[PDB]
Amino acid sequence: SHMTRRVAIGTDHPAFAIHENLILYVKEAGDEFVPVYCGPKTAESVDYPDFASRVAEMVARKEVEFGVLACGSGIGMSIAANKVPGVRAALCYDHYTAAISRIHNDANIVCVGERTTGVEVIREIIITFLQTPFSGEERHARRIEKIRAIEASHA
Amino acid sequence: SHMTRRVAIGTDHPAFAIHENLILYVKEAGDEFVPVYCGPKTAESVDYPDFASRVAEMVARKEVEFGVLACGSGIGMSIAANKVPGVRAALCYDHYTAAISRIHNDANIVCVGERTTGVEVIREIIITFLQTPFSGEERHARRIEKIRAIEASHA
Amino acid sequence: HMTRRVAIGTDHPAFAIHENLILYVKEAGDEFVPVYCGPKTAESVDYPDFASRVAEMVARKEVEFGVLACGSGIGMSIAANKVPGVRAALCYDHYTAAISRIHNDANIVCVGERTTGVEVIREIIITFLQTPFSGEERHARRIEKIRAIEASHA
Amino acid sequence: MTRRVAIGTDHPAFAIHENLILYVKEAGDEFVPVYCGPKTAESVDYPDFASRVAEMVARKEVEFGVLACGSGIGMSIAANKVPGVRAALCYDHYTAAISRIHNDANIVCVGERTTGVEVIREIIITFLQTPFSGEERHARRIEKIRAIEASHA
Structure with missing residues (x-):
């Protein structure tokens, strides 16, 4: 069942202490999600x-x-x-930021702080991010396309 | 006295409601700072x-x-x-984020949420950002240079 | 199937958002009725x-x-x-909105107008009102301990 | 003069009780932690x-x-x-500072599941180091809180 949706995971040194948490949180968002750990070993x-x-x-x-x-x-x-x-x-x-990044910006990477944010809120962030669809609205799509035009203009 | 340091300011529509706040908070960081409003009029x-x-x-x-x-x-x-x-x-x-984005990443733009963060905290963010120097440390500079190598690898 | 009344108050800085707070209570669902008691x-x-x-x-x-x-x-x-x-x-x-309900059966939510933007205040209010108490024995036990602290000073 | 700081936790926050002891000492040599939490x-x-x-x-x-x-x-x-x-x-x-400035708060409460330790450190240091404003409107409000307590004693 499902299309496999792979989620690559990376950290720095202070967040290596929570890398197994991040793996687990990704799986908790749903059985279609498969973590790929790319972080420091x-x-x-x-x-x-x-x-x-x-x-x-x-x-x-x-x-x-x-x-x-x-x-x-x-x-x-x-x-x-x-x-x-x-x-x-x-x-x-x-x-809120986890959901809104998805809804408005169809974000594809979620970045979190191990020194700033406690692990249960990191959990909630990841799960929210991976469960929340994009809004589908014209203005959001238009804004996202504008980001793409900024990238294209410096390539 | 001082070198003038200009600070450009921009918003979207919901944050246009606080654009006068942003101008003020940039001046409160110190009298060398000069706001240049570029946001919607x-x-x-x-x-x-x-x-x-x-x-x-x-x-x-x-x-x-x-x-x-x-x-x-x-x-x-x-x-x-x-x-x-x-x-x-x-x-x-x-x-903490305002300070650390300067200390570790020598950040040059500070981004804030008008729907998320109350104005007295936006104030504290701006002031802190503009008064906090970059750490100088070898590891932070080395990382910032890797960011620039990412940009060059896609130019 | 009565509605659920929600009293609302502010100080002076938060008077600027008293209409938003009434609205967000209503957005939590038709079963919630705001009762504004704050400064007029x-x-x-x-x-x-x-x-x-x-x-x-x-x-x-x-x-x-x-x-x-x-x-x-x-x-x-x-x-x-x-x-x-x-x-x-x-x-x-x-998280705080939800967990205050789940763990503490909280009955009042407090928010800051100078600290927290209105769309997150909205989310906090809606989550607080919609989220149920866990019902778990350890939480009930802790809440009863809080009552024992009030009674020891009554 | 020694300023003493009693510390307590629950079970999840027992994991950072050593942090809490440390951050109190980091606020200045005059601050002394007294750990009262679970052992x-x-x-x-x-x-x-x-x-x-x-x-x-x-x-x-x-x-x-x-x-x-x-x-x-x-x-x-x-x-x-x-x-x-x-x-x-x-x-x-902000909250750590303003709790002192406006309400002369005497206890700081923090979440181990919610707030990362380096922010907990900042909170503790700021709370201990920031003075009460002394302004009449703050003192009046604080006395109103005492009157609420007295009305229920």
Whole structure:
């Protein structure tokens, strides 16, 4: 049953401590969702852009449909990921932002902070993000297309 | 005395209601800061990416040193602004994010949500963003340079 | 199948959103009726006078729930919880709104107008009113402990 | 003068009790934490720890409290049932500061499931370091809270 919707996951070093939580939260959104962990495999020092880039590139080719990125605050992951054309990476810190990133911006990557946001709210963020459809409205689609034109104008 | 530091400001339609607040909060960060309002001039309908692009291009050229973007949640502005090379636009919702986006990521645009974040916290965000210096640390600079290598790899 | 009354009060900064708070109660469903008790005007007011008015309504059961707003929400939650029978929850997001119900059977939601934007206030109100109490024994036990603290100072 | 800070948790927040002790000390050498929370990972009911800390504050045995549970809210409802206590649910710097500035809050309540530890640190430091405004309208409101408590005693 289902079309498999793969979700690539990456972290930095402080968020490596919650990488198994992120895997689990992705599966809790629904049985169609399959996590693909791309993050650091150990507690060694890492630079978040390297994992943002790995995830974001998978998202942009649609090797996976969605990404989940975690760092200290989420901010660094959101800046790095959005540098990949085709990506719409949303820094989410609550239910509202998780849902609205989907509804308005059809976001494809959710970025969270391990040092900022407690794990039960991260859970709620991921699940909300992965359960929430895009609105379908003309103005939202138009705005998203405008982002694509910004990318095209710098390519 | 001082070097003048210009700060470009842009909004969408819901955040046009607070554009005078944004101008004020930028001046309160210190008398070297000079706001340059680039956002909508009336309550007319707008698409946030048009103003994200305007502010982000100004920052990327260094017509201004910093930008402030406001929309519903902040998220659209961050996604759009980050599509301009040279921009590092941070979605901030509290003091900690405002500070850390400077300390770790040397962020040059601060993005806030008028529907999500009350004005006294938007104030605190802007002021904190504009008074907080970049850490200087080797690992933070190295990561920021990896962000630029992401942009160059798609140029 | 009575409707469910929801008393509402504010301080002066949150008077600017008193119409939004009435609206969001109604948006939680036709079974919820707002009862506005807050300042009628933009005059100076002290939050505890409105916290007390709402909280007394909840504690006597003239309403089922309360909504309080001030600058940050915190003032209201401190004041309202000084009335016995009140469990007033400062909420700032969906999770807090929901969990205050689930775990604490909270009867008053407090929000900040200076801190929290109106669409998240909306979500908080709607979630608070729609979410049921867990019914679980450990939560009921903890809530009974809170009542034992009030009774030890009555 | 030593400013003492009593600390309590529930079971989920027991996981960060060492953090809480640390962040209090990080607010200045004069702040001393007094850990009153559960000593192990056993089951507990937050109102029992809220009551412990809140009575210490209300009877002037310590100047401040810090209470942590899942969300912070249980602690803040429980603690505020003790007369003399002004317990503030804080989730960021602004709330931590303003609770002091406006309400001279004496207990800070935080959520371990909701707020990451580096923000909890900021909250604790800011709460302990920020002074009460002293302004007449704040003092009047705080005395109104005491009158609510006195009207139900």
